Every structure is written in structure tokens, then in C-alpha cells.
């Protein structure tokens, strides 16, 4: 043999270092450890969107639970928050509902008042007030 | 496990020996030597390649033509079998045709 393999064990260790916490023969059999590490890395790469969706659904569920505990709903709250020129994502809303209940109750009261003003303007087809807390700000 | 535990001894080599320090001496003697002998004549080795490259089968043909009349029996048989195999592999099998 001429200039054969003299550093194969290093590659085996480099492959097995990612399989040091598995159950069965997958942590010792290289032929199976290769496939196991491949699938593990593929799933770890593809699960980013899954993690994002899970976090977003958890935030939505927390906001819905807080709105139901205060005395409102989730779609109406989201609509009244998007119709009041205030841009707050779901994370800060969940953080407030979990830690700062006073500002969340104030936001719920503002949302209820905006919804009532919108209903009044829809039933009156407005003319004159059209909501005190309404009046969009024009940015030129 | 195919890894040697103990380290090998340091193979020291004197880079200023005989053939190492005197490498390339008397090379290209035709140009600056009024053209007396060709530089290919300074190659020492098998007689069937002193100044000739060739292919894998061409070397075997040249060996059977020059030295083939003064070899052994088993060696000549093996050379003939190898020549037949190279012929069948080059003029029948392959690609780009």
C-alpha cells in the first residue's frame, strides 16, 4: 500500500462527537450514527419555521386568554389595536398581560371604547364627532 | 483501530549527500557542449526505455520486441497475456467512439 489512510479515526471521532447522547447502538455504530446525525441536523435546520409558528401561536393563545379574562375577544382586540395607530406585536402584548396588568387593562378599555365608537359611527353613518379617540394623523 | 500509538522515530535525512548535492550535473550537454552526445543517453535503467516514453501497451510491445527474445517462460507468458488483455481492452472496450 502507498500513501493509504492514516487518519481515519479522527473522522470517526468527528462524526461521533455529535452522537454522544443517543439511545441504542446509534451512539457506537458509525454506519447508523452517520444517518442519525444527518437526520438530526436536517430536522434541526428545518424546525426553525416550526419554532416560529409555535411561538406565534403561543403568543396568540396568551393574548386570547388575557382578553377573555378581562372581558373581550381576540379578533376585536386586534382590530381595535390596529385601528388606533399603535403598532405593538404579540410579544410585547403577552409580556404586558403576564407582567403589567394595568397597562393591559387600559389597552382593553381603549379597545372597547374604539369598538363602541366604530359601532356608533356605523349606525349613524357618522357625521360630526366620528369618534373622539379616532382622527387618524396624516404624515406627509 | 488502525492508529499507531507511539510516535515514529525522527527520520533524519542529510539533504547535502552525494546525489542530492550533485543533482542535475552534466545535464543539457548538447547546447553548451558543441553537440557530442544527446542528453537522453545519460538515463540509466531498462534498455527498452532509454530515451522513449510510450504508452502502457507500447512499452510491453517494445519489451517483447527487444528483450522478448531473451526472457523466461513464465515471464514471457505473463507478458503475452497482459498484451492480449490490453489489446482487448483498448481496441474493443472503452468510450468516446
Amino acid at each position: 500500500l502507498r500513501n493509504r489512510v492514516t487518519d481515519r479515526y479522527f473522522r470517526i471521532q468527528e462524526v461521533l462527537k455529535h452522537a454522544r447522547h443517543f439511545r441504542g447502538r446509534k451512539n457506537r455504530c458509525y454506519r447508523l450514527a452517520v444517518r442519525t446525525v444527518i437526520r438530526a441536523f436536517v430536522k434541526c435546520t428545518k424546525a426553525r419555521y416550526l419554532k416560529k409558528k409555535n411561538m406565534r401561536t403561543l403568543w396568540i393563545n396568551r393574548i386570547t386568554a388575557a382578553s377573555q379574562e378581562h372581558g373581550l375577544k381576540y379578533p376585536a382586540l386586534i382590530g381595535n389595536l390596529v385601528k388606533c395607530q399603535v403598532e405593538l406585536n404579540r410579544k410585547v402584548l403577552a409580556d404586558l398581560a403576564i407582567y403589567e396588568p394595568k397597562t393591559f387593562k387600559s389597552l382593553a378599555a381603549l379597545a372597547s371604547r374604539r369598538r363602541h365608537e366604530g359601532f356608533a359611527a356605523a349606525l349613524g353613518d357618522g357625521k360630526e364627532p366620528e369618534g373622539i379617540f379616532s382622527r387618524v394623523v396624516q404624515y406627509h | 483501530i488502525g492508529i499507531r500509538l507511539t510516535l515514529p522515530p525522527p527520520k533524519v535525512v542529510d539533504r547535502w549527500n552525494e546525489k542530492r548535492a550533485m543533482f542535475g550535473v552534466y545535464d543539457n550537454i548538447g547546447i553548451l557542449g558543441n553537440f557530442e552526445k544527446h542528453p537522453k543517453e545519460l538515463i540509466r535503467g531498462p534498455i527498452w526505455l532509454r530515451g522513449w516514453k510510450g504508452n502502457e501497451l507500447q512499452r510491453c510491445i517494445r519489451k517483447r520486441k527487444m528483450v522478448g527474445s531473451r526472457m523466461f517462460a513464465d515471464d514471457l507468458h505473463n507478458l503475452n497475456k497482459r498484451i492480449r488483455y490490453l489489446y482487448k481492452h483498448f481496441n474493443r472496450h472503452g468510450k468516446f467512439r
Binding site: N3, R4, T6, D7, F10 | G2, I3, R4, L7, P8
Partner: peptide
């Protein structure tokens, strides 16, 4: 035998690392 020295040196360094990791000196 397998001819080489660099892979053997890396393996010896790995052995020394494992030795100093298993037996921590003061």
C-alpha cells in the same frame, strides 16, 4: 505498519489532552 507522523502527532496530542482532562493537575 502505516507510514506517517502528522496523524500520529495529532493522535498523541489528543491522548495528552484526554490525560490532562481525566486527571486535572493542581
Amino acid at each position: 505498519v502505516k507510514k506517517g507522523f502528522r496523524a500520529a502527532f495529532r493522535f498523541q496530542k489528543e491522548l495528552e489532552r484526554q490525560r490532562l482532562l481525566r486527571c486535572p493537575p493542581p
